[PDB]
Amino acid sequence: SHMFVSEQSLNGRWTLKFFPQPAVPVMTIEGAEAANGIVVDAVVPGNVEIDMEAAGLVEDPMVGNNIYKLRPYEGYQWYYSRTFAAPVVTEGQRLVLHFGGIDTFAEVYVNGIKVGSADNMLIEHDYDITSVVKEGENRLDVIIRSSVMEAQNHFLGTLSIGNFSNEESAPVRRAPSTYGWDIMPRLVSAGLWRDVTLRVENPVTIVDANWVTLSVNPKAREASESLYLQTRLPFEMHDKVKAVITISRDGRQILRKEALMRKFANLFTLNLSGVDAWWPRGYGEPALYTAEVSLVDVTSGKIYDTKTSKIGFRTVKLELDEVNLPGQPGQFQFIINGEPVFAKGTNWVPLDALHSRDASHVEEAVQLMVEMNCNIVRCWGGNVYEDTHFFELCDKYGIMVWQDFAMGCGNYSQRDNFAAALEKEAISVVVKLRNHPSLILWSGNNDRVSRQVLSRVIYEFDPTRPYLPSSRGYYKDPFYTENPSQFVSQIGYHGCPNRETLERMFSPDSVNPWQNGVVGMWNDEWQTKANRIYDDKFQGGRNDLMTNQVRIIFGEVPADLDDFIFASQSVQAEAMKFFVELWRGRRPYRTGIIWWNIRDGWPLLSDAISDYWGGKKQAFYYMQNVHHDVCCLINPAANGYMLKVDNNTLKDFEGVVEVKDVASGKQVFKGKFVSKANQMSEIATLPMQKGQGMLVISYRIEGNEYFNHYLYGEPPYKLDQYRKWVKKCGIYELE
Amino acid sequence: IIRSSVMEAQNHFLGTLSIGNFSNEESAPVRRAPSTYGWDIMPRLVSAGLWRDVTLRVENPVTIVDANWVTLSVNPKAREASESLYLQTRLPFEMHDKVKAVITISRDGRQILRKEALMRKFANLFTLNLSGVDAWWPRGYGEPALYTAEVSLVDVTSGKIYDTKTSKIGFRTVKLELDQPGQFQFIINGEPVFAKGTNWVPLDALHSRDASHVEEAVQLMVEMNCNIVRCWGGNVYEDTHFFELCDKYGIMVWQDFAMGCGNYSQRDNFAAALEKEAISVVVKLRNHPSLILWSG
Amino acid sequence: IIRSSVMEAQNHFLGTLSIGNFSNEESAPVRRAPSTYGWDIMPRLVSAGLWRDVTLRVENPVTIVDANWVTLSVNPKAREASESLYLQTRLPFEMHDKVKAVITISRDGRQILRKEALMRKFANLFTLNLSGVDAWWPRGYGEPALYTAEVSLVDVTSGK
């Protein structure tokens, strides 16, 4: 009832002073104030380019070639400053200054006294400022250095040079994609990109509450849950404090346990009844339960601290296939609550190049995966680690999370200084995320980094989850169809974004892609949205993937912009849909497919199926119809085709299915089928049809009508005849 | 000025494996005897204090840092053995070529060997091929023959003795012949011995009284006729006198490093504290013939 | 001011496997040539002093930290080769996009290959596909063909 702890936000308006970084970087408050620079208003959480654009000092980086105009600020320093009132601290309490995100190399001062030196963009930074804080008004100053210039303080190994990830990224703990990628612009940025708060703690406080599902019995509605509790506990308070442990759901108390605190750290085991297991989408309900622990004085009832979260009773195992194709990647399958689950989902890339806006995108971005019905998502190591709320949403909606540690495409230093920086980061992120039921896998894609540093962290701080040391042309080419990986990471096909997105990110004279009307030659602004990392004038490159892919499927590249959008999105839609159906149709050998990708992190031309502004490409709806719990699909056979139905649930379903020709209306097949639980079931073999065309699949399950299709024949097709088949099928609108 | 051991534990963040074991979470990040926090066979009595000797030592510029005696080979029927002396010293350079090591093996006044060697460097290996020496055996398999091994540093001209190290060694070889836990056998001087003995637990919850119990407690093993004793990792390491008695009565010693009943930290901080401890205890005890096994 | 190398060895407690070897115990904990303490083919002469050149060097803010040449592949029959240059430089941020790297492979004054690239970052990997070059062979197996490889950091505006 009575609250003896509190958290006061330091978010809001700050003062931001920026200037070019001298040869000797500015480290002190006196140097930052004596330096000659520009002072503007800043918003925390934020990025400095946001503050600068609000002051009219930079142009919108999302339009045209404006991204290259931010180049000089990579060599700048950034000085945050504000005042704050210190909260009332009683005798023994501790005041903690909390940073959710400092980007990156910065000296932190409170009342002119240094309290910390941050050097990791991806993790939290907490400082005990109890003794340095004064009565009344206090000063908080953060002086950030240039991340790019920090790289030259290090001598690189041979393996760290020439990778797709930037050499500037190798010796520093930052998201590698911020230096530029083929799917993200170069925007190093800086600033306080997550919350800054002031926490008041009691001498008796919870240091960590670690919930672990030892076992789960779904049929009996039981589970065994362990609580690893670490606290600060003055010895005078030993035997005078009790832990109050509650499992509840919507106010209704499931279990209550109280235990006297005779030592600072304890293991409490809870044997629960009447509790449902946590399942990913399709395989059941994502049952969640409020788990709460409080440190309570046994005499006065004083609540010294309380930790509350929603946990899910679930076990996860990575069943390795060590018989078939030893050494091949993807020879494994996820086992959730003892059931082998078929994984299907997207790779997760940055939500925004200015990551202070990540949090405002996460609700609608997770809703993309919910509408798609992904049961898994892989957080790519090129991005930052997402915050707690992303994993809360994945807990709530039953989306399993595969978490890469933040590494780019390359090899890294084997020396002690880098190993210590990565270990501190790994321990921080693991302790923070290890209680979310949606998280199922750590990945660190011999190397000391992947085979020793990260493995020792998972071994000591998360024994409950598996760890993995390591991770164009025609879509029916043998490079795709002959891949024997059970669990594949699909490469992705390009898709020209919607017209409204093109007209929003390109200048009016650059909306049309063809330079001087020459089909195949991209203008300079389209080359920038390749993404082109550096401002280098050249022709061709990554954008030629759009034309070469429509030239294989449709023979010729349309000159009209609207017809080019249809051709490009159609190739992307057919390719990605074909890859999902190919893996779902070849179960039980195939065990999962994680495709690239569902959402852009910036207005760009990419292989994502939905752009930065929420513009869904045609591939999104194609993929949606092949991601259902029960899906009737058609795989190519040696002679003819094979109508199949795949089931990613633990329940049996029945229904009827009808396969017809879209152009002639003739019935190729129509029969009743039994879709057995958690397996692929072949229905019937279909003969080869004459020439090109399309087949329409119409199946009915439990009074619900679902629709699919299959494009038969060999390319090249005629773009206008394919358009007629889409309209005559009645499933997907043209545009 | 001693601090609270229990409270020191809260200066550390424990890994999952260190929580919930039978050994106390307070024991996991500190280098103390785990049984002092309580056990099923020992009371909780954390205690504190200067529980062993406090002395002032005066050393000369020339001094012996370590005298490490190693038995390379033994031939009991021929009454021979090859003994190595690994000698480390502090030696000013002006004292190089001016000091000699005097190595003497003796048994009850009878001198077995007297070798003198000019000190030309600070560390040296002296091989001693001995005659008329009996091998060291555990109880039942023969005599626990011990010899006084003495090394002294002596000025060549003035004859002044700068330092002297003296202990009783035994000429013995130990091999662990492997063949499921416990699939091994101790080979002592080439013979396969059948081991029979007890585990060794704290002599007292107040460990400053261990030294007053060790004579009678070892006599329990002599009356019992144990030929082996396993010093439990829940206890402190026994002092030199315990191993002196085990040398004398022919009781082999299997020594656990001081670990509780659970997994420990994997971070560099704990590894550095444990390495320092292990180097200290190994150098202190590696010269006793009774000691035959280290266990982690 | 140089100290005694011999006396430095007594700052270290030696392990058992470091005592009794052919090399001196004084050699085990120090980073010196072990033969200086004596061997069966070299006398004992510890010595001391500044035994190699001492120089004062002046470096520009734009300077080459390391030029690492690596032969990926070679085809001696076709007189072709693939050479990589792992270049690490010191580069103030003001000089980013204003300096170019100039790479020249030559032999006895005749130029074989030349490549220019704008320095956009401090470290770079350059790939050179070379024609008309001979492979390096040990004695007997061919000629020890060498080529002068030069890299320079050049101001794109003034040519300095």
PDB file of N, CA and C in Angstrom, chain A residues 20 71-75 148-149 151-152 154-158 161-162 166-168 534-536, chain C residues 65-66 68 70 86-94 96-97 118-125:
ATOM      1  N   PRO A  20      32.515  20.775 -34.004  1.00  0.00           N
ATOM      2  CA  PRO A  20      33.476  19.800 -34.534  1.00  0.00           C
ATOM      3  C   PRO A  20      34.437  19.340 -33.448  1.00  0.00           C
ATOM      4  N   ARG A  71      26.766  13.886 -43.369  1.00  0.00           N
ATOM      5  CA  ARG A  71      28.152  13.407 -43.289  1.00  0.00           C
ATOM      6  C   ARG A  71      29.052  14.186 -42.334  1.00  0.00           C
ATOM      7  N   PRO A  72      29.098  15.525 -42.345  1.00  0.00           N
ATOM      8  CA  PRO A  72      30.049  16.214 -41.456  1.00  0.00           C
ATOM      9  C   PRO A  72      29.792  15.980 -39.976  1.00  0.00           C
ATOM     10  N   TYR A  73      28.543  15.741 -39.579  1.00  0.00           N
ATOM     11  CA  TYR A  73      28.237  15.614 -38.161  1.00  0.00           C
ATOM     12  C   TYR A  73      28.790  14.335 -37.544  1.00  0.00           C
ATOM     13  N   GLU A  74      29.248  13.384 -38.359  1.00  0.00           N
ATOM     14  CA  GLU A  74      29.944  12.223 -37.821  1.00  0.00           C
ATOM     15  C   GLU A  74      31.218  12.611 -37.084  1.00  0.00           C
ATOM     16  N   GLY A  75      31.809  13.760 -37.408  1.00  0.00           N
ATOM     17  CA  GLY A  75      33.004  14.212 -36.724  1.00  0.00           C
ATOM     18  C   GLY A  75      32.733  15.251 -35.654  1.00  0.00           C
ATOM     19  N   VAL A 148      32.924   7.590 -34.907  1.00  0.00           N
ATOM     20  CA  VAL A 148      33.777   7.242 -36.041  1.00  0.00           C
ATOM     21  C   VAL A 148      35.248   7.390 -35.670  1.00  0.00           C
ATOM     22  N   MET A 149      35.605   8.515 -35.045  1.00  0.00           N
ATOM     23  CA  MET A 149      37.001   8.760 -34.698  1.00  0.00           C
ATOM     24  C   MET A 149      37.517   7.808 -33.625  1.00  0.00           C
ATOM     25  N   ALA A 151      37.332   4.641 -33.710  1.00  0.00           N
ATOM     26  CA  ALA A 151      37.874   3.448 -34.353  1.00  0.00           C
ATOM     27  C   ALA A 151      39.382   3.538 -34.538  1.00  0.00           C
ATOM     28  N   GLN A 152      39.906   4.741 -34.789  1.00  0.00           N
ATOM     29  CA  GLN A 152      41.335   4.903 -35.035  1.00  0.00           C
ATOM     30  C   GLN A 152      42.174   4.785 -33.769  1.00  0.00           C
ATOM     31  N   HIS A 154      42.336   2.065 -32.361  1.00  0.00           N
ATOM     32  CA  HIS A 154      42.515   0.621 -32.352  1.00  0.00           C
ATOM     33  C   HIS A 154      43.190   0.173 -33.639  1.00  0.00           C
ATOM     34  N   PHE A 155      44.048  -0.836 -33.523  1.00  0.00           N
ATOM     35  CA  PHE A 155      44.694  -1.465 -34.667  1.00  0.00           C
ATOM     36  C   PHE A 155      43.908  -2.718 -35.034  1.00  0.00           C
ATOM     37  N   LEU A 156      43.455  -2.785 -36.280  1.00  0.00           N
ATOM     38  CA  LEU A 156      42.553  -3.840 -36.715  1.00  0.00           C
ATOM     39  C   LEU A 156      43.318  -5.076 -37.168  1.00  0.00           C
ATOM     40  N   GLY A 157      42.721  -6.240 -36.914  1.00  0.00           N
ATOM     41  CA  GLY A 157      43.231  -7.467 -37.478  1.00  0.00           C
ATOM     42  C   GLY A 157      42.789  -7.650 -38.916  1.00  0.00           C
ATOM     43  N   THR A 158      43.500  -8.537 -39.618  1.00  0.00           N
ATOM     44  CA  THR A 158      43.246  -8.743 -41.042  1.00  0.00           C
ATOM     45  C   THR A 158      41.794  -9.123 -41.304  1.00  0.00           C
ATOM     46  N   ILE A 161      38.931  -6.326 -41.717  1.00  0.00           N
ATOM     47  CA  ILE A 161      39.013  -5.375 -42.817  1.00  0.00           C
ATOM     48  C   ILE A 161      38.459  -6.032 -44.074  1.00  0.00           C
ATOM     49  N   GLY A 162      37.647  -5.283 -44.819  1.00  0.00           N
ATOM     50  CA  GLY A 162      37.088  -5.766 -46.063  1.00  0.00           C
ATOM     51  C   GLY A 162      35.760  -6.478 -45.945  1.00  0.00           C
ATOM     52  N   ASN A 166      31.258  -2.106 -41.628  1.00  0.00           N
ATOM     53  CA  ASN A 166      32.301  -1.097 -41.740  1.00  0.00           C
ATOM     54  C   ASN A 166      33.433  -1.361 -40.753  1.00  0.00           C
ATOM     55  N   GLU A 167      34.653  -1.018 -41.176  1.00  0.00           N
ATOM     56  CA  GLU A 167      35.807  -1.126 -40.287  1.00  0.00           C
ATOM     57  C   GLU A 167      35.663  -0.219 -39.073  1.00  0.00           C
ATOM     58  N   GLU A 168      34.923   0.884 -39.214  1.00  0.00           N
ATOM     59  CA  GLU A 168      34.636   1.739 -38.068  1.00  0.00           C
ATOM     60  C   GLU A 168      33.819   0.999 -37.015  1.00  0.00           C
ATOM     61  N   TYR A 534      27.869   5.413 -49.454  1.00  0.00           N
ATOM     62  CA  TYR A 534      28.610   6.642 -49.682  1.00  0.00           C
ATOM     63  C   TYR A 534      28.160   7.301 -50.979  1.00  0.00           C
ATOM     64  N   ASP A 535      28.311   8.625 -51.037  1.00  0.00           N
ATOM     65  CA  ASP A 535      27.886   9.421 -52.191  1.00  0.00           C
ATOM     66  C   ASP A 535      28.885   9.212 -53.328  1.00  0.00           C
ATOM     67  N   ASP A 536      28.732   8.081 -54.014  1.00  0.00           N
ATOM     68  CA  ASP A 536      29.576   7.696 -55.140  1.00  0.00           C
ATOM     69  C   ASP A 536      28.709   7.610 -56.384  1.00  0.00           C
TER      70      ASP A 536
ATOM     71  N   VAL C  65      49.231   3.866 -41.220  1.00  0.00           N
ATOM     72  CA  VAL C  65      49.580   3.097 -40.030  1.00  0.00           C
ATOM     73  C   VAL C  65      50.169   1.745 -40.417  1.00  0.00           C
ATOM     74  N   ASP C  66      49.571   1.072 -41.398  1.00  0.00           N
ATOM     75  CA  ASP C  66      50.076  -0.220 -41.841  1.00  0.00           C
ATOM     76  C   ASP C  66      49.583  -0.510 -43.251  1.00  0.00           C
ATOM     77  N   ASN C  68      49.367  -3.779 -45.543  1.00  0.00           N
ATOM     78  CA  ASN C  68      49.450  -5.234 -45.453  1.00  0.00           C
ATOM     79  C   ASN C  68      49.157  -5.831 -46.824  1.00  0.00           C
ATOM     80  N   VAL C  70      48.835  -9.024 -49.329  1.00  0.00           N
ATOM     81  CA  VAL C  70      48.459 -10.431 -49.256  1.00  0.00           C
ATOM     82  C   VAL C  70      48.197 -10.938 -50.668  1.00  0.00           C
ATOM     83  N   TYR C  86      45.462  -4.563 -47.409  1.00  0.00           N
ATOM     84  CA  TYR C  86      44.751  -4.177 -46.193  1.00  0.00           C
ATOM     85  C   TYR C  86      45.420  -2.915 -45.665  1.00  0.00           C
ATOM     86  N   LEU C  87      44.800  -1.767 -45.921  1.00  0.00           N
ATOM     87  CA  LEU C  87      45.373  -0.470 -45.590  1.00  0.00           C
ATOM     88  C   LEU C  87      44.697   0.102 -44.351  1.00  0.00           C
ATOM     89  N   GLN C  88      45.501   0.471 -43.359  1.00  0.00           N
ATOM     90  CA  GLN C  88      45.032   1.177 -42.173  1.00  0.00           C
ATOM     91  C   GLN C  88      45.763   2.508 -42.090  1.00  0.00           C
ATOM     92  N   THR C  89      45.009   3.590 -41.911  1.00  0.00           N
ATOM     93  CA  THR C  89      45.569   4.933 -41.908  1.00  0.00           C
ATOM     94  C   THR C  89      45.050   5.725 -40.716  1.00  0.00           C
ATOM     95  N   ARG C  90      45.805   6.760 -40.360  1.00  0.00           N
ATOM     96  CA  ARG C  90      45.318   7.817 -39.487  1.00  0.00           C
ATOM     97  C   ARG C  90      44.743   8.921 -40.364  1.00  0.00           C
ATOM     98  N   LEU C  91      43.492   9.290 -40.110  1.00  0.00           N
ATOM     99  CA  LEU C  91      42.752  10.176 -41.007  1.00  0.00           C
ATOM    100  C   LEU C  91      41.819  11.053 -40.184  1.00  0.00           C
ATOM    101  N   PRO C  92      42.177  12.319 -39.962  1.00  0.00           N
ATOM    102  CA  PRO C  92      41.245  13.236 -39.299  1.00  0.00           C
ATOM    103  C   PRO C  92      39.940  13.302 -40.075  1.00  0.00           C
ATOM    104  N   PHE C  93      38.844  13.552 -39.357  1.00  0.00           N
ATOM    105  CA  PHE C  93      37.552  13.508 -40.032  1.00  0.00           C
ATOM    106  C   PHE C  93      37.403  14.627 -41.053  1.00  0.00           C
ATOM    107  N   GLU C  94      38.067  15.768 -40.837  1.00  0.00           N
ATOM    108  CA  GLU C  94      38.049  16.821 -41.848  1.00  0.00           C
ATOM    109  C   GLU C  94      38.650  16.337 -43.162  1.00  0.00           C
ATOM    110  N   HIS C  96      38.473  13.231 -44.281  1.00  0.00           N
ATOM    111  CA  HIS C  96      37.621  12.245 -44.929  1.00  0.00           C
ATOM    112  C   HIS C  96      37.010  12.843 -46.189  1.00  0.00           C
ATOM    113  N   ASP C  97      36.966  12.040 -47.252  1.00  0.00           N
ATOM    114  CA  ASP C  97      36.475  12.406 -48.579  1.00  0.00           C
ATOM    115  C   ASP C  97      37.354  13.445 -49.267  1.00  0.00           C
ATOM    116  N   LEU C 118      39.020   7.131 -53.461  1.00  0.00           N
ATOM    117  CA  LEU C 118      38.780   8.151 -52.450  1.00  0.00           C
ATOM    118  C   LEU C 118      38.716   7.508 -51.071  1.00  0.00           C
ATOM    119  N   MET C 119      39.502   8.040 -50.139  1.00  0.00           N
ATOM    120  CA  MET C 119      39.508   7.566 -48.757  1.00  0.00           C
ATOM    121  C   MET C 119      38.235   8.040 -48.071  1.00  0.00           C
ATOM    122  N   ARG C 120      37.276   7.132 -47.902  1.00  0.00           N
ATOM    123  CA  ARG C 120      36.048   7.440 -47.187  1.00  0.00           C
ATOM    124  C   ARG C 120      36.038   6.891 -45.768  1.00  0.00           C
ATOM    125  N   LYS C 121      37.010   6.054 -45.414  1.00  0.00           N
ATOM    126  CA  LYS C 121      37.147   5.540 -44.060  1.00  0.00           C
ATOM    127  C   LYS C 121      38.622   5.265 -43.804  1.00  0.00           C
ATOM    128  N   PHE C 122      38.959   5.049 -42.530  1.00  0.00           N
ATOM    129  CA  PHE C 122      40.364   4.961 -42.142  1.00  0.00           C
ATOM    130  C   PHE C 122      40.999   3.641 -42.567  1.00  0.00           C
ATOM    131  N   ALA C 123      40.213   2.572 -42.669  1.00  0.00           N
ATOM    132  CA  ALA C 123      40.719   1.256 -43.033  1.00  0.00           C
ATOM    133  C   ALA C 123      39.961   0.733 -44.244  1.00  0.00           C
ATOM    134  N   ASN C 124      40.690   0.123 -45.175  1.00  0.00           N
ATOM    135  CA  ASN C 124      40.104  -0.315 -46.432  1.00  0.00           C
ATOM    136  C   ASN C 124      40.810  -1.570 -46.920  1.00  0.00           C
ATOM    137  N   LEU C 125      40.086  -2.362 -47.706  1.00  0.00           N
ATOM    138  CA  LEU C 125      40.641  -3.505 -48.418  1.00  0.00           C
ATOM    139  C   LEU C 125      40.558  -3.219 -49.909  1.00  0.00           C
TER     140      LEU C 125
END
